[PDB]
Amino acid sequence: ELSGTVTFWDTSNEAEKATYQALAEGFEKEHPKVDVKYVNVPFGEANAKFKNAAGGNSGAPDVMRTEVAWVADFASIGYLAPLDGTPALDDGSDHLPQAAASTRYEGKTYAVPQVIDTLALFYNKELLTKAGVEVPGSVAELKTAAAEITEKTGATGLYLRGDDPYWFLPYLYGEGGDLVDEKNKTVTVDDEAGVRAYRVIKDLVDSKAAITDASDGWNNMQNAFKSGKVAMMVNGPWAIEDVKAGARFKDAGNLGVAPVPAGSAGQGSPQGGWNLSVYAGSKNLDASYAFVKYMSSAKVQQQTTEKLSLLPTRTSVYEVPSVADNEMVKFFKPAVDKAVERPWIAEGNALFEPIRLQMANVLSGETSPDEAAANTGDAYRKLLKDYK
Ligand SMILES: C[C@H]1O[C@H](O[C@H]2[C@H](O)[C@@H](O)[C@@H](O[C@H]3[C@H](O)[C@@H](O)[C@@H](O[C@H]4[C@H](O)[C@@H](O)[C@@H](O)O[C@@H]4CO)O[C@@H]3CO)O[C@@H]2CO)[C@H](O)[C@H](O)[C@@H]1N[C@H]1CC(CO)[C@H](O)[C@@H](O)[C@@H]1O
Helix, strand or coil, rough: CCCEEEEEEEEECCCCCCHHHHHHHHHHHCCCCCEEEEEEECHHHHHHHHHHHCCCCHHHHHHHHEEHHHHHHHCCCCCCCCCCCCCCCCHHHHEHHHHCCCEEEEEECCCCEEEEEEEEEEEHHHHHHCCCCCCCCCCHHHHHHHHHHHHHHHEEEEEECCCCHHHHHHHHHHHHCCEEEEECCCCCCCCCCHHHHHHHHHHHHHHHEEEEECCHHHHHHHHHCCCHCCEEEECCCHHHHHCCCHHHCHHHHHHEEECCCCCCCCCCCCCEEEEEEEHHHCCCCHHHHHHHHHHHHHHHHHHHHHHHHCCCCCCHHHCHHHHHHCHHHHHHHHHHHHCCCCCCCCCHHHHHHHHHHHHHHHCCCCCCHHHHHHHHHHHHHHHHHCCC
16 A cells, blocks of 8 residues: 655656656556656755755655765664565565665664766777777776877867866876775875876876866766767766767767776776665655665666666666667666775765865866875865864
């Protein structure tokens, strides 16, 4: 017996949201006495919007699309219903383990996995071919390629997103670095790899291998890539359908994807994604648990992939020929398998702001790579009282 309102806050983007609204409302097919109230909440506003509503117990959603780092955020302050022993969890073991870790806080389950993702190098196949260059495997190989692209086509090699701190991580990993050593509770972002990573990004822009912008970075990146102003960008699966809307990439075939470039030490890309959580103060808990089970079901994950090319969290879904034979998926799944995990801690979400500020100042020339790394480390030690 399910009935009543289930308000769902979805953070998915302009290209994704019609699909997600349809899936959400599809819950009513099997439960016609439930009224699904779909609301799209912009990614940048959603964390604060949810905390505001939950903290005041006023107009909070029943079900929240919850970024991997937000689960511990929200859970630690009491805003999420624990899900262990509820109908929200069905065939839990099916989910990728690294997806499952992000749902956990202090020995309890506060979310169900929805999608998993990572960053990759997207490229314009026809531009690279016209430039006579191969997809670059390293930063060194990207610089050489960018020069040939400018010389032969007039395009810039890379749009380097300059306003979102997540985009720093591939460069950090490529220089042999990482934010923290979790096992040893030690801040590591200010090791020499951090200095090198800030220096690499500045060199890419100064050398004109890359362009960037200090604001409106998502739109600027997409516009530059779709208009052929650049040959390459670093982005994730949430960009695929948006890109394919463009005249340049209808022929889905013209859209190349490859790993993010190696740096001087190695190569890596971060693990991200989205889970589904239930507000602790929901006045329709049964219907919400069922809604979460439905939205995380193999059937719905498969449909999401078919319409959007977003990656399922369920292992079984990869065995469905329709998913197993998808080319964006065929690339992204192995890349996700290799993606770097982060500490799933209450202050994990706040590790990004320090990077954002220092990265902006490095790109504008206000701050040296050396100072930026030290500043980032200083901010982490302030955030993480039991880290050295
Ligand atoms: C600073 C923020 O730090 C963190 O976020 C990390 C995040 O943990 C990383 O994993 C990564 O997330 C990936 C994501 O995994 C990936 O899927 C994709 O998301 C797509 C969707 O796919 C697409 O469907 C649609 O939704 O659109 C999504 C976006 O395209 O890309 C994400 C990266 O963009 O990177 C984030 C850092 O960016 C915090 O969580 C904060 O919320 C914080 N926000 C601040 C906002 C404030 C402003 O006043 C205010 O000052 C600050 O205090 C606020 O806190």
